[PDB]
Write a protein that binds this ligand. Structure first.
Ligand SMILES: NCCc1c[nH]c2ccc(Cl)cc12
Ligand SMILES: [Cl-]
Length: 273
């Protein structure tokens, strides 16, 4: 079984997502992350193409699993009496974006542009696979430090992507849009763009722009750090109060601030190595 297939290493982290351990697949020494999620904490359940009852997280990870390295790859999963165990790929060396920004402070715009571009490509991949992440934030982004490649993790608050209104939300409140705070209603893509605006501000300022519900609703963006006019314009556009005033992913990627992005390897060479 699972216990013989994997060699357990130290705890990497724990929180809303469960408990994640460093591990090694015994057959080929492959680095893995072993995530444990208690059954009593799983509210969203779904079913695989065959019809087995699994957490929605497993459904969403399988839908996004492919060669594309912008999303974490689910290698296997196991059901225990009181929990589900997920075997995920583990880049080495790795650091999540929250720890990275905490240690290094506000990012140089060239670095934020490379990171933000990769997040946008990863989110577009999720949407193309019929998956809405619902918790895009620094803590849910891993940096493969050698390759300069970012990976979205923690699909535990996600949903199947739909074109109708969402009236449920269990992601991070400080990244949630004003329409959710005010009306408990949002559409997937425009709510994702709002969270991307929060994330971009966080990258270039070193902290999130809003703390309280009143600030999210007012949506007044103050820059606490020196940030270029083009970057400020893009952030303020993603953070438009009206969902219809927000840019589409195409408009974000065609924005003047997004031009001449570095390749991930160039990004690692200049900023990470
Ligand atoms: N601080 C992030 C903790 C975490 C959550 N899901 C993961 C998947 C892979 C790896 Cl390497 C780590 C994690
Ligand atoms: Cl994960």
């Amino acid at each position: 079984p699972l216990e013989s297939q994997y060699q357990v290493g130290p705890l990497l982290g724990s929180g809303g997502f469960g408990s994640v351990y460093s591990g090694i697949r015994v057959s080929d020494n492959l680095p893995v992350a072993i995530k444990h999620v208690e059954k009593d904490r799983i509210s969203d359940w779904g079913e695989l193409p065959n019809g087995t009852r699994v957490p929605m997280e497993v459904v969403l990870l399988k839908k996004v699993s492919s060669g594309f390295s912008g999303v974490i790859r689910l290698l296997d999963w196991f059901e225990r009496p009181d929990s589900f165990v997920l075997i995920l790929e583990r880049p080495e060396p790795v650091q999540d974006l929250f720890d990275f920004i905490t240690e290094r402070g506000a990012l140089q715009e060239e670095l934020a542009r490379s990171f933000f571009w990769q997040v946008l490509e990863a989110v577009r991949h999720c949407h193309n696979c019929g998956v809405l992440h619902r918790d895009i934030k620094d803590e849910n982004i891993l940096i493969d430090l050698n390759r300069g490649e970012l990976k979205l993790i923690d699909f535990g608050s996600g949903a199947l992507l739909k074109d109708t209104v969402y009236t449920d939300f269990d992601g991070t409140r400080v990244y949630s849009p004003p329409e959710w705070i005010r009306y408990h209603r949002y559409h997937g893509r425009s709510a994702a763009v709002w969270s991307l605006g929060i994330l971009l501000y966080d990258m270039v300022c070193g902290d999130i722009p809003f703390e309280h519900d009143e600030e999210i609703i007012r949506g007044q963006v103050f820059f606490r750090q020196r940030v270029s006019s083009e970057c400020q314009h893009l952030i303020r556009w993603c953070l438009a109060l009206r969902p219809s005033d927000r840019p589409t992913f195409e408009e974000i990627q065609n924005h003047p601030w997004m031009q001449d992005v570095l390749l991930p390897q160039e990004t690692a060479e200049i900023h990470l190595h």
